[PDB]
């Protein structure tokens, strides 16, 4: 019976071992366990209807025993990478039924998985990123708990200085959610964009998670072009008043906001924008000015400028125009 041997090899991978007086049995045990994982990865990726009901607790148990650990202030990445892979192909499988898995993938599991985002291994955080994205898309009953617990991590990172190596990869997930949001946006989300996503531009380690943060900010305005006024005004607030090469990030974000800005809302914030933008063209840092002047290579911006030339050119070149 094949279903029995599947469970045997699963439980076999729940035995964590160590040999200090036998460096060869250790290697075999590793190789025996690395091989059993590979065998199961192939078995589940290519065979149809092999995922039966008794399997689910075995898989979640095998994942929890290997992955849910304590992160040192990993080394056996060959093994850890196979586990995430197997668990990933297990979620993606067409034989996967969330109604049965909902029993064993509870909130405690999701919580424990989020602890691992603090890990300092980019390749591990990349597997955790993908894994959490499959859970959200199939476990409707966990979508709320995840948002609440992610909204917690961010709140801890801005205010309580709870540094997190996983901020970048968490934002990347949120963008996948924001892009699929529903008709009127809930106030729960608006608050998050305003009272969480924008204050993220305030933290010092912005250099690491800025591209993904900007994506979420743009995806929010792509849905509801109502929030483009408080977004832009906040960015000019959080704008580094100190002339620094970190302005290039804001110019990037602002040009990315302008490529999707609704012209009816552009005029609502076009004056305070260019006052700052003119300051950038006058910056003592070439990279800042070079970037602000690269705005003109944007055709949709030029149209927005010429259709409002009466207000812009006075600000950009006050020597040459008046009001």
């Amino acid at each position: 019976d094949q279903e029995k041997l599947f469970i045997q090899k699963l439980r076999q991978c729940c035995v964590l071992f160590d040999f200090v007086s036998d460096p060869l049995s250790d290697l075999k045990w590793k190789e025996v366990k690395r091989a059993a994982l590979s065998e199961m990865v192939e078995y589940i990726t290519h065979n149809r209807n092999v995922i039966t009901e008794p399997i689910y607790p075995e898989v979640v148990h095998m994942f929890a025993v290997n992955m849910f650990r304590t992160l040192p202030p990993e080394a056996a990445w060959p093994h850890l990478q196979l586990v995430y892979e197997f668990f990933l192909r297990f979620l993606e499988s067409p034989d996967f039924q969330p109604n049965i898995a909902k029993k064993y993938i509870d909130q405690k599991f999701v919580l424990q998985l989020l602890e691992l985002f603090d890990s300092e291994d980019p390749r591990e955080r990349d597997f955790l990123k993908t894994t959490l994205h499959r859970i959200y898309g199939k476990f409707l009953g966990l979508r709320a708990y995840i948002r609440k617990q992610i909204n917690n991590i961010f709140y801890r990172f801005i205010y309580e200085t709870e540094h997190h190596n996983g901020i970048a990869e968490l934002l990347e997930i949120l963008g996948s959610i924001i892009n699929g949001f529903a008709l009127p946006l809930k106030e729960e989300h608006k608050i998050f964009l305003l009272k969480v996503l924008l204050p993220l531009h305030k933290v010092k380690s912005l250099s690491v998670y800025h591209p993904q943060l900007a994506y979420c900010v743009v995806q929010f305005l792509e849905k509801d072009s109502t929030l483009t006024e408080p977004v832009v005004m906040a960015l000019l607030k959080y704008w580094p008043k100190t002339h620094s090469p970190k302005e290039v990030m804001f110019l990037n974000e602002l040009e990315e906001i302008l490529d999707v800005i609704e012209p009816s809302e552009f005029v609502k914030i076009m004056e305070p924008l260019f006052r700052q933008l003119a300051k950038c063209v006058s910056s003592p840092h070439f990279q800042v000015a070079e970037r602000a002047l690269y705005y003109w290579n944007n055709e949709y911006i030029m149209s927005l400028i010429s259709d409002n030339a009466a207000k812009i050119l006075p600000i950009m070149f006050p020597s040459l125009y008046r009001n």
Binding site: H133, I177, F181, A182
Partner: peptide, 12 residues
């Protein structure tokens, strides 16, 4: 960084 495909929010 993109990569991940969107998730159509629908009634929980």
């Amino acid at each position: 960084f993109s990569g991940l495909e969107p998730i159509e929010e629908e009634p929980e």
